[PDB]
């Protein structure tokens, strides 16, 4: 039962439903872009992201000797129709690989159920969508209709390997940290991946290694989706909450350690975790109270009780006699723990049976150009480690020295730190 039930081509004609010219609510102007709806609540825009941030409109670098070590610029990437076709197919293929695991099925199901909360209304008896959780889709008659969505995958901005999960803020509300959630825009490319080293002492050393093994891009996307899950349920950790790494005031956010999981997650001390968990549980109670006071809805895309049921389902709320909603500690803790401890990069690594960095705290060695769309290169089931070939065992398919035709090294980062 595939996640993406159509095999889109980029040049397939627009139909205003799942192949459409859209605008995003950046609070400024833009020419429509061609987008593809690959699943309920999830869209793919094969364009370089010059739209989410008005000050990152330019695909050219900061000058030749202005730039960060782990970075890669190519202003022509993703400018042509063949590259957009291929980007679309590559991204689809990674959703299918993820979805083919039970962990991935769970995570993508929680993302689709994770509809951003309708807390846009200034009247506490009235439930309203926040419009930055929508896109504007041009219909066949050439007019615009607003469409709620949970996730957009878009190409990277100027720095091709700066993958991240962004979302539109609110004037007052902290949407990704108040339980509400907001639509998530992942900057991501399936056309590149990172090199790492199989020895831990090497991988965590800035001066050693050329990056012998390649990260499976399904792992990289899953990392971004895990962030997105947190942000859709409005439980992301404030990035100012950091762990001090111990020669340079190096720190790492808790939100990152959590997302990686494994040994790394244990560096977040128990008092602080209890404090976040209590905090988010309180946020959810504020949502339960807001739903209780809602008598009216705005719009007529759905009924008040349709939407209450939607949020009941999202937040796993208990419903008593009056149709009064409450939060049950047990169900809150299971959800919370699902989204923070079960969904983690490290867990994904076990599911995919791939070689991966052992810690979030490593020094990237290199960046490689890849092509995962041909089945002779990469499949849903095996990634690069193709069954019943010489690349099946020992992660040989990720080994850039053995599987050398699937990887072109574009830049070394080692030494430049």
């Amino acid at each position: 039962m595939p996640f993406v039930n159509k095999q889109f081509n980029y040049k397939d004609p627009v139909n205003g439903v799942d192949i459409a010219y859209i605008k995003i609510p950046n609070v400024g102007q833009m020419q429509p872009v061609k987008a593809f709806k690959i699943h309920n609540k999830i869209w793919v825009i094969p364009e370089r992201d010059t739209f989410t941030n008005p000050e990152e409109g330019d695909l050219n670098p900061p000058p030749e000797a202005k730039q960060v070590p782990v970075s890669y610029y190519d202003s022509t990437y993703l400018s042509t129709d063949n590259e957009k076709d291929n980007y679309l197919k590559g991204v689809t293929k990674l959703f299918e690989r993820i979805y083919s695991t039970d962990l991935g099925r769970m995570l993508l199901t929680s993302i689709v159920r994770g509809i951003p909360f309708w807390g846009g209304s200034t009247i506490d008896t009235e439930l309203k969508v926040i419009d930055t959780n929508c896109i504007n889709v041009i219909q066949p008659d050439g007019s615009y209709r607003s469409e709620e969505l949970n996730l957009v995958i878009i190409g990277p901005s100027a720095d091709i390997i700066q993958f991240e999960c962004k979302s539109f803020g609110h004037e007052v509300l902290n949407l990704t940290r108040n339980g509400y959630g907001s639509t998530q825009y992942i900057r991501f490319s399936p056309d590149f991946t990172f090199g790492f080293e199989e020895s831990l002492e090497v991988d965590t050393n800035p001066l050693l290694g050329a990056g012998k093994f390649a990260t499976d891009p399904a792992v990289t996307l899953a990392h971004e989706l895990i962030h997105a899950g947190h942000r859709l349920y409005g439980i992301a950790i404030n990035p100012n909450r950091v762990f001090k790494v111990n020669m340079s005031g190096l720190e790492v956010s808790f939100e990152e350690l959590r997302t990686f999981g494994g040994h790394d997650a244990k560096f977040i001390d128990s008092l602080q975790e209890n404090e976040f968990r209590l905090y988010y549980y309180n946020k959810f109670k504020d949502i339960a109270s807001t739903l209780n006071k809602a008598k009216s809805i705005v719009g007529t895309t759905a009924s008040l009780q349709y939407m209450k049921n939607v949020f009941k389902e999202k937040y796993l709320l208990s419903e008593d006699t009056s149709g009064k909603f409450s939060v049950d500690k047990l169900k809150f803790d299971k959800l919370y723990k699902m989204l923070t401890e079960i969904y983690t990069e490290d867990n994904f690594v076990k599911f995919f049976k791939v070689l991966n960095r052992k810690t979030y705290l490593n020094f990237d060695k290199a960046v490689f150009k890849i092509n995962i769309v041909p089945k002779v290169n990469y499949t849903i089931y095996d990634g690069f480690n193709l069954r019943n070939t010489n690349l099946a065992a020992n992660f040989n398919g990720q080994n850039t020295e053995i599987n050398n035709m699937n990887f072109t090294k574009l830049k070394n980062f080692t030494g430049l730190f």
């Binding site: 993958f163 990392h223 730190f417």
Partner: peptide, 8 residues
């Protein structure tokens, strides 16, 4: 800001 070395 993910990636550790990009957020350093």
């Amino acid at each position: 800001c993910a990636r550790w070395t990009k957020c350093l």
